[PDB]
Design an enzyme around this catalytic site. Structure first.
Site, mmCIF file in Angstrom:
data_model
loop_
_atom_site.group_PDB
_atom_site.id
_atom_site.type_symbol
_atom_site.label_atom_id
_atom_site.label_comp_id
_atom_site.label_asym_id
_atom_site.label_seq_id
_atom_site.Cartn_x
_atom_site.Cartn_y
_atom_site.Cartn_z
ATOM 1 N N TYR A 249 0.781 -1.249 0.000
ATOM 2 C CA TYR A 249 0.000 0.000 0.000
ATOM 3 C C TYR A 249 0.825 1.320 0.000
ATOM 4 O O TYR A 249 0.537 2.257 -0.749
ATOM 5 C CB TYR A 249 -0.932 -0.018 1.206
ATOM 6 N N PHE B 145 -14.855 -0.468 4.513
ATOM 7 C CA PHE B 145 -15.342 -0.881 3.196
ATOM 8 C C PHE B 145 -14.367 -1.728 2.356
ATOM 9 O O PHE B 145 -13.383 -1.236 1.777
ATOM 10 C CB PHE B 145 -15.761 0.365 2.404
#
Ligand SMILES: NC[C@@H]1O[C@H](O[C@H]2[C@@H](O)[C@H](O[C@@H]3[C@@H](O)[C@H](N)C[C@H](N)[C@H]3O[C@H]3O[C@H](CO)[C@@H](O)[C@H](O)[C@H]3N)O[C@@H]2CO)[C@H](N)[C@@H](O)[C@@H]1O
Ligand SMILES: NC[C@@H]1O[C@H](O[C@H]2[C@@H](O)[C@H](O[C@@H]3[C@@H](O)[C@H](N)C[C@H](N)[C@H]3O[C@H]3O[C@H](CO)[C@@H](O)[C@H](O)[C@H]3N)O[C@@H]2CO)[C@H](N)[C@@H](O)[C@@H]1O
Ligand SMILES: NC[C@@H]1O[C@H](O[C@H]2[C@@H](O)[C@H](O[C@@H]3[C@@H](O)[C@H](N)C[C@H](N)[C@H]3O[C@H]3O[C@H](CO)[C@@H](O)[C@H](O)[C@H]3N)O[C@@H]2CO)[C@H](N)[C@@H](O)[C@@H]1O
Ligand SMILES: NC[C@@H]1O[C@H](O[C@H]2[C@@H](O)[C@H](O[C@@H]3[C@@H](O)[C@H](N)C[C@H](N)[C@H]3O[C@H]3O[C@H](CO)[C@@H](O)[C@H](O)[C@H]3N)O[C@@H]2CO)[C@H](N)[C@@H](O)[C@@H]1O
Lengths: 402, 402, 402, 402
Positions: free
Chosen positions: C126, C402
């Protein structure tokens, strides 16, 4: 008050009466479709039971399924798949089991079968009835995060993500190809396929719903499941591969999944997985259990039907302490095939029927048996020959449990 | 840009440095006197270190033990045993390890050894250099109160209760007779004995205080411990037995301790114990792991050394990617003995030296390596013959670790 | 040589491929009407996928949801919520991810979103793509039976017990009130509330049906469960308060349940729960893990949007090794607001983009980053001043994941 | 009944009385050499006891160690470290503890100390007496095998292994360089250093013997520890680092111990270690707990000694329910330096003496106290300016336990 009556066929009231006893002895309610599937495998005249004082329910039960098992060298034999054996909690210690077993073996015998086969259930007693441990299941575990494949390792790709229920005919076929090539392979009726892929929450133990990988020459079923951790790991429920690349590409896919920390499989002894990784320590072998047990019901038949890894010419005295399936046979193995002639020459080797049972898919060494005097000879070296001859070509793996 | 230095001899200051690194590297290490025995065993010009940018302690260290390993068919070979290898966490960064290995292994060949051997340290890369796992330990564990010997099993008696330090010489040559018989056998200088039976609190490790069972042809050293439960369990530190009589006898004594719940041991793959009991389920095999790693330092020397199990004529190309101990060899095996000459002929079978090493003690099967391309042939049963020949007839047991 | 492919609109047999991939890739498949809701949030041209050679299912997938993020200072920005990114474990190692992330980010950029946000999942690489950890989540465990508030501490009461479903709107309004005040605040679409209060057994863990508490200014969702003991404890699933008194009053509630041995919640770093007790030791802080990650897509846009805590006249050199949203910026911050404008001056402060991201919602100190040389300046106080500026009054906290 | 007297000095027979009562109250009797170490630190008229009827043993004890705390801005103050507080479990619930504290705190006050300090234990009632939590101790663990350092990260090199025993001075020197920079830095008398490197086994928590890594600007001290399953974690007991590099170099060192699956540490709130790794997730914050507690004895003296991060001119009303060290105070801060005199004007912020002690090393955020009404002001941005002023440039870390 002990006489067994062999059911000619299993009526719906008989099965209800059996699924009552079985429920007590085995745990859960295996779902309606799973047992129906099992019931469909029962040849007729194959269900020996013992009723109670008033014949309201059964207080002992047995049956064999109609199975076809691969043995070394490749031949299929029909085997009697002994199962759903139970004696009521209430009637034990009054010799129900023995009585019912004799009658089931005379039915198994007369019905033709050369071998009887089972899986061991807790509390069972098997050795003295002539059953030996034939295959070994070895639980192996890989921490996916650190496993890293060997340079030389195949990398064939060509693995689809699958919904298993939608490829019944596909999978079932892959399985069959492996079945014919792998000792301990049972044939699996469309019934059981239907029932496996269905993914009954009941039979489901050890994870959630079922994931599957697909290859032209293999497939893999596995479930994901979380621990107290939150951290999940994969459990492989069946990984059947018919080519080395199938096998490899599947293990590659399996350690692919980033969600999971470990993957465990319950495999056969010499699985190639560790040799695929740069360092065998990355695969972690963590148990070795019995799987398939075997009573040889007809020696010559069983012994001729399978192939052998060394040549041997000997007389073999089989002890049978339950029936009369033993005796002295003349084993003569010539170019890896045998001719097993009944005799009454003196013997070279004495062997208990349970240990002849066990050696039979090549999973053992005479070492343990000999040193335990279940395998006798004045001739130490000959007994080593015998074991080499009986050793396996390919590693036995039972196809599924019953 | 870094050159290692061979120490002609290990001084007190060296050893202090060596001890200090090896503590950081392996965890608070053996007592002074154990260390003294290992040192005892290091021949001359056998220590390679990478000195610190200025010499106080080292950045890199490696040495090898003068050892004597038993190979199949009972020949004994001098082997170099790579121990105390370690790179100081402060330089694991910069390729020190390959530097030392190159030099140390140079040394090992200049000295004559046909084999290098080691046990695995956490963090070590090993097959890169040509070490393969050559023997295995299974952790068997029996529940005493439920175990039960087979009616057939020998009950020879002959077991004496022992204080271990007090029959050092006796024990010591039971172990020798064993060593002489079993592939994997390390010789064991009295230095090492006196260290073990000294039974020191630090080197006790997992348990209480050595107990011993003596027998004319075997011994068993064990320790009891109890954990949070309040319940005890014996752990067998070593069980060496020359007859199957010794072994049964010893195992009978072992499962006789009322005091004890389980009895654990760390032994070889095909141990008689489970076969000794009425139900192989009573014994519980749990974990299987690597023991001894081998690098063949001289293919013809080492190949000619042992004996084999089938015949075989093949030309073997042996791939080394670290040194040049590689090349094409004629392997000619008949009646057990092997003649192995260098050649220009075309090879039948390619093989990676790290797998040649693994197979060397009879431990594995070909299937695995073949499956992963660490062992190739266009002929697929030439392979099956090769393997069939390299197999053992006594399970290999590493004598002790180092 | 892989070309990815943007779905202008999600089909049904498109959503099928995506769920299948996602199930293989994130453990369970969340209930249908959970999926329905997320899919409801995916804007046009916002889905990037990679088909198989066959093109039957997807082997790569990714998408963003159009969202609404609150930043320090109360401004609310539209944000690409990167979700469901997944690569078939079969075509791993084929760097589909870079192929997809690169198209999905061109999309995001075209769309005009200033930030992109995500929650992390296993294997996620990431930082490499300029993402930074932007909010932190502390887990807290109060043991009710020894906990007890401070004498000085508010006791407003006004907490009704609710049935969650029935006050969907009421809840929603309270939440919304929090959201606009709290950096981290995501808008929650009605679709999602519905699915939340719906309470389907399949994305409940751990506990039972969902209990709740309602203040005029706050609420608290929780589940209860029997553990091993089996004694009961309450996982607070979500607690939203607009005023200190709702906080107080709700905690008061929670700690007055009786079944409960302890109450646990995941929450932000400076939660006043422990300051509310006579002794902070009652409130065991368990973990501190990552929650929301941020990639700044438009540096000026995003910097200008929020507001600040110190003043600052500095030239910023944002470094971006994934895309090209880097460059040098005159960042001048005067009394709250910042005008950040692209410039040519040399830098004062250099800064990796992932760092700018994580610093954005305020929840970091520059110390760590600087130490790593992820934050470089020659001027020592300049750095500490940058920190000063980018801090924030309200502790950041993500609304939902999410 | 209860009348405490204050020992002028501790006589050997007085120390045995205290060691007696201490064992009952604390368990392990710290080795002789430990106890002497502390005795060493106890100044004149610094011991307060309650004797029993016979006046043979003590039934209540307390003392304070003469110490040297480092506060914000780097100024050192003398602080009284309350230690060894006991009450015979026989005479508990008789008001012994309040009596003892009251006199102990005059001794402290008359001695001239601006701060009392302690590390909390047991029950442990501490709030009401004016003590607030001052510094925080966050537990971190790193799975070494999976952790990678960020590419940007220092690899300063420079670390040696040590026998820490043989380096007391150079260790203590590094510790000293650190103590004067970090808030919470205690001075560590040679006596104490000597007892730490003494490595006695009956004070050995978390492993076996002490390992050291030394850098010119820092050192790490750690023990190694073996789990049930035989895998070692390594737990850092002290990692003192004076520069950024030393901190990087030592972690880089620690994480390079192949032996070790995880490293762990009890450190301060904003350590750089997770920022040094490519993914902050490889480092795991696993607890957050109270370390050092503080009571301000002399508000003016104390507030003047430290430096501040903002500015403000406020009237400060300090509550105190145990003494009368509170009062109303003119507190004006500019240049980050504060003048604080008693004033009779009306207050802007009313503050419990807990929370001044707690807020003192710049640990906390004022939102918590304010919500819980232990910190009060009408003007809500005055609290905010107070807190901002009271924050700290350097994360505070207690020097060592007492
Ligand atoms: N004779 C004992 C048998 O026990 C049975 O119960 C089950 C178990 O006892 C048996 O478990 C076997 C186990 O014996 C064996 N030692 C190892 C094996 N791993 C298990 O089998 C397991 O793995 C395979 C997956 O490939 C599955 O076919 C099977 O469902 C699964 N339980 O598999 C049986 C079927 O699931 C029957 N209830 C009973 O009919 C029968 O008498
Ligand atoms: N080259 C690697 C080596 O790692 C070594 O590490 C030690 C251990 O790793 C090694 O332990 C081995 C273990 O690797 C191995 N996987 C299995 C074996 N059972 C263990 O050995 C253990 O059992 C044997 C007998 O069973 C004992 O003699 C031995 O003392 C005991 N530690 O035995 C070594 C000595 O106990 C040495 N520190 C070092 O000399 C050397 O570098
Ligand atoms: N990129 C990760 C994404 O996570 C999703 O899956 C789930 C997880 O990733 C995510 O879990 C997050 C976790 O990542 C995160 N680091 C911390 C957080 N505690 C978890 O979220 C949890 O907490 C919040 C409320 O506190 C809930 O709103 C949420 O439903 C709950 N699962 O919450 C998602 C469940 O709604 C999506 N399947 C997919 O976009 C992708 O996996
Ligand atoms: N609680 C009161 C104090 O307790 C003491 O006992 C010990 C413990 O209370 C105290 O332990 C503290 C713990 O309370 C504390 N709130 C958190 C901290 N992690 C521990 O300290 C621990 O870590 C520190 C480094 O941080 C080490 O110096 C120390 O060896 C270790 N005890 O450290 C003290 C000494 O090591 C004294 N017996 C007593 O004089 C005194 O009144």
């Amino acid at each position: 008050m002990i006489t067994p009556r062999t059911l000619h066929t299993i009526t719906d009231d008989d099965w209800t009466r059996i699924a009552l006893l079985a429920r007590f002895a085995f745990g859960d309610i295996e779902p309606e479709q799973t047992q129906a599937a099992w019931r469909s495998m029962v040849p007729e005249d194959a269900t020996v039971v013992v009723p109670d004082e008033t014949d309201d329910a059964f207080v002992g039960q047995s049956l064999y399924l109609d199975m076809q098992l691969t043995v070394p060298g490749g031949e299929v034999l029909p085997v009697a798949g002994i199962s759903f054996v139970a004696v009521a909690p209430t009637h034990r210690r009054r010799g129900v089991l023995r009585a019912m077993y004799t009658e089931l073996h005379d039915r198994i015998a007369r019905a033709g079968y050369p071998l009887a086969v089972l899986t061991a259930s807790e509390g069972g007693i098997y050795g003295r009835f002539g059953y030996g441990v034939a295959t070994i299941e070895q639980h192996v575990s890989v921490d996916r995060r650190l496993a890293q494949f060997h340079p030389a390792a195949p990398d064939p790709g060509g693995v689809r993500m699958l919904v298993p229920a939608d490829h019944r005919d596909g999978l079932a076929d892959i399985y069959d190809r492996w079945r014919r090539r792998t000792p301990g392979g049972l044939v699996r009726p469309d019934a059981l396929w239907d029932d496996l892929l269905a993914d009954r929450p009941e039979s489901r133990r050890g994870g959630g719903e079922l994931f599957a990988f697909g290859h032209q020459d293999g497939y893999a079923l596995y479930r994901v499941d979380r621990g107290p951790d939150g951290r999940r790991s994969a459990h492989v429920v069946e990984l059947t591969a018919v080519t080395a690349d199938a096998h490899a590409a599947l293990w590659r896919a399996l350690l692919g999944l980033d969600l999971i920390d470990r993957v465990s499989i319950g495999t056969h002894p010499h699985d190639p997985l560790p040799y695929l990784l740069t360092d065998p320590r990355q695969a972690q072998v963590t148990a070795s259990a019995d799987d398939l047990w075997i009573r040889i019901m007809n020696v010559p038949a069983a012994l001729e039907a399978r192939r052998y890894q060394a040549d041997l010419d000997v007389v073999l005295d089989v002890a049978d302490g339950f029936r009369s399936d033993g005796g002295r046979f003349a084993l003569q193995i010539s170019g890896g095939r045998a001719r097993c002639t009944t005799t009454d020459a003196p013997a070279d080797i004495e062997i208990d029927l349970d240990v002849l049972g066990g050696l039979y898919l090549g999973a053992h060494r005479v070492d343990g048996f000999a040193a335990a005097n279940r395998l006798r000879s004045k001739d130490s070296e000959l007994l080593q020959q015998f074991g080499a001859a009986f050793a396996g070509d390919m590693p036995a793996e039972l196809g599924y449990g019953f």
